[PDB]
Ligand binder design. Structure first.
Ligand SMILES: O=C(O)/C=C\Sc1ccccc1
Ligand SMILES: [Mg+2]
Length: 709
């Protein structure tokens, strides 16, 4: 047992103790009133939560039947008739208030990190200011060509390339009145303005307003602060340093404001299947909000002198969101009298919201998240406006339990399910006074696309999906809906993760497409990645881009509804086989770390040994594609078995560097991980909206139980 009785609820003792001892003290909430509200909110909202999941089922059955016995006009008309495609509401503007500047105004990189990893969470929180020299020297952005490779010790030829890259950036972002930063010799602050000594005549900024401050003596600054497109750049001056001595102006480093916000993830990047796991997560979220999390500690605020003369302070930390789990799953951290597990989304709202109160107070711990008095919650995997409204009502009720003013808890709406995509305007409307972002992505949305039209026929390959008509319309449609609902100057419009964590030259070259499309934020896989992607927001004036796009409708419903069916016999046998192996090793590589080790986010080599940093949604797309090919006779169940068999020892070799790893091959049926992977495929077509959590959670729980005996 080991549970506590609170009305109809039976709470895991480890959760009960954590909340009473760690979470509640200092919030001024009566403990007995807190738990009374938990029981009340759970009893009150559970039936509607269940009603909504049943409605997903009802709609998908109808669509399944439609396809089995079968143009856009009939299809569209059908979706409208069944309650899937809802009417578009009249124009409106969001009324969200109490929102920090990092979100309403500033455009820049956004980091996403598993909350259960204290070390990563700390680095993410501290990633708001990152070294441009480290990011350039340490990655392939500066070509590792002959003579410029990074060896065991510092290479000066490589470093001199790092320095020129940075000077080229400075010229491009904060131009001098005449000449370049490349030829500078010194920096002084004379009568409130920045003076750059060149080797002949000195010069000022072409736009004097880009000078934001300095440190050290005004006559010999230890650093110079600049600003461009709302993001700070800091030039550190120190000829008495490893790098500065070679620098013809004494510049030690260039620091960029990078990850201006971070999402602390409880959902797809973590493996948390029971009370003990949820508490580890909650404890870290609590450490972050208190400002006392340590593993390595949290950065404190940064002090500067204003150009005129007075002292000011800039936040030393990423502004934090938390991503709660979605509406589907239950978790036995709380069960009812009958033994039935409570919905995890309801619990996340209550517990992560309580904890977040600590981030709005200084002692007791030392640090603050939101100055403006908001709590930021990302809600994933919502399907349409009724599900958005339910979330907003959940937050309203939690706010009541916690004694917060209404609309304290803001919502970040992930557009990652088809029924949200096609009803986007109504979804934003349903959250008009709470919404602080919308964003798109590849993995979950493509998995939902596949599952929704499972019965329509064979889908194109996973690589091909990235450039299909439906997904390009999807991306444009999301921005369009945001801007037209007033997001510019008010709420973030965000795009998806760059997964290839080692291919930084490739990221810098191509991810710039995202701000060019009017996204004020985009996801990056690491602090180093945040620093490099920040370069893009200096080249692109996102605010100006968004102003350009307002009033334009770039996507039609037809384009959105365009199912990615393959053309008649698109593939040769070898291409069919490559795709199967690709998807089988995608599944195995991720599942083996999840089930065996409880790791939901890590650098995982793919079939071409490219390091990818993906979350659980990689399981959704890969298992759905294989289920689809199996459903329509593209491949056979023997083909799947054979592929899983071939790829397993390949995955084993990929995990050679791991101490705790236990190999799947040659004995597959003895491996819960392998069996989990096989089940995800063969049972894929039957999972609700193709979600993988039901199978995954069961298999990890099975692993944890066997390991206890
Ligand atoms: O990859 C990371 O840095 C952490 C996991 S979150 C995520 C990864 C891939 C796509 C979307 C989200
Ligand atoms: Mg997702």
């Amino acid at each position: 047992t080991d549970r506590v009785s609170v009305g109809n609820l039976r709470i895991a003792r480890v959760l009960y103790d954590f909340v009473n001892n760690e979470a509640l003290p200092g919030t001024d909430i009566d403990p007995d009133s807190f738990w009374a509200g938990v029981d009340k909110v759970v009893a009150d909202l559970t039936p509607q939560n269940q009603a909504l999941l049943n409605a997903r089922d009802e709609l998908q059955a109808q669509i399944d039947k439609w396809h089995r016995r079968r143009d856009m006009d009939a299809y569209r008309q059908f979706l409208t008739e069944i309650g899937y495609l809802l009417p578009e509401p009249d124009d409106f503007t969001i009324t969200t208030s109490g929102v920090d500047a990092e979100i309403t105004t500033t455009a820049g990189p956004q980091l996403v990190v598993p909350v259960l990893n204290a070390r990563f969470a700390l680095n993410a929180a501290n990633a708001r200011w990152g070294s441009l020299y480290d990011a350039l020297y340490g990655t392939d952005v500066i070509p590792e060509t002959d003579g410029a490779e990074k060896g065991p010790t510092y290479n000066k030829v490589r470093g001199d390339k790092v320095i020129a890259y940075a000077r080229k950036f400075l010229d491009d972002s904060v131009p001098l009145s005449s000449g370049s930063f490349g030829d500078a010799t010194g920096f002084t602050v004379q009568d409130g303005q920045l003076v750059v000594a060149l080797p002949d005549k000195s010069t000022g900024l072409a736009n004097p307003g880009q000078f934001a401050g300095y440190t050290g003596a005004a006559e010999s600054p230890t650093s110079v602060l600049l600003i461009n497109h709302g993001l700070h750049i800091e030039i550190l001056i120190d000829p008495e340093s490893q790098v500065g001595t070679t620098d013809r102006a004494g510049v030690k480093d260039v620091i960029l404001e990078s990850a201006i916000t971070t999402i602390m993830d409880f959902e797809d990047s973590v493996a948390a299947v029971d009370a003990a796991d949820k508490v580890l997560g909650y404890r870290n979220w609590l450490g972050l909000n208190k400002g006392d999390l340590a593993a390595r500690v949290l950065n404190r605020d940064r002090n500067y002198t204003a150009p005129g003369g007075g002292q000011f302070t800039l936040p030393g930390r990423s502004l934090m969101f938390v991503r709660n789990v979605g509406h589907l799953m239950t978790n036995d951290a709380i069960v009812d009298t009958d033994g039935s597990e409570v919905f995890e989304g309801i619990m996340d709202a209550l517990f992560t919201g309580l904890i977040a109160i600590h981030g709005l107070k200084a002692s007791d711990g030392p640090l603050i998240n939101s100055r403006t008095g908001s709590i930021y919650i990302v809600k994933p995997k919502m399907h349409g406006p009724a599900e958005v409204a339910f979330t907003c009502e959940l937050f309203s009720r939690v706010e009541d339990v916690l004694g917060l003013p209404q609309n304290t808890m803001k919502i970040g709406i992930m557009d990652e399910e088809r029924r949200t995509t096609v009803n986007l305007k109504a979804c934003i409307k349903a959250a008009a006074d709470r919404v602080v972002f919308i964003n798109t992505g590849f993995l979950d949305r493509t998995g939902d696309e596949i599952h929704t039209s499972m019965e329509a026929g064979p889908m194109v390959r996973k690589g091909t999906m990235k450039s299909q008509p439906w997904i390009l319309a999807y991306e444009d449609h999301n921005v369009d809906a945001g801007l037209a609902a007033g997001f510019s100057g008010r709420a973030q419009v965000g795009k998806g993760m760059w997964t290839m964590t080692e291919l930084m030259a490739d990221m810098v070259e191509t991810k710039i497409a995202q701000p060019r499309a009017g996204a004020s934020t985009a996801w990056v896989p690491s602090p180093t990645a945040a620093t490099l992607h920040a370069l893009h927001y200096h080249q692109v004036d996102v605010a100006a881009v968004q102003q350009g796009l307002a009033g334009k409708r770039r996507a039609t419903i037809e384009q959105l509804l365009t199912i990615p069916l393959a053309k008649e016999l698109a593939w040769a046998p070898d291409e069919i086989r490559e795709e199967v192996d690709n998807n089988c090793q995608s599944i195995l590589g991720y599942v083996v770390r999840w089930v065996d080790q409880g790791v939901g986010a890590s650098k995982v080599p793919d079939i071409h040994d490219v390091a990818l940093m993906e979350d659980r949604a990689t399981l959704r797309i890969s298992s759905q594609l294989l289920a689809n090919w199996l459903r329509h006779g593209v491949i056979t169940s023997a083909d799947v078995r054979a592929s899983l068999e071939r790829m397993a020892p390949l995955v084993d070799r990929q995990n050679a560097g791991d101490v705790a790893y236990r190999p799947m091959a040659p004995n597959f049926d003895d491996s819960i991980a392998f069996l989990a992977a096989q089940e995800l495929i063969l049972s894929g077509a039957q999972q609700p909206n193709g979600y993988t959590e039901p199978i995954l959670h069961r298999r990890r729980r099975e692993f944890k139980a066997r390991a206890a005996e």
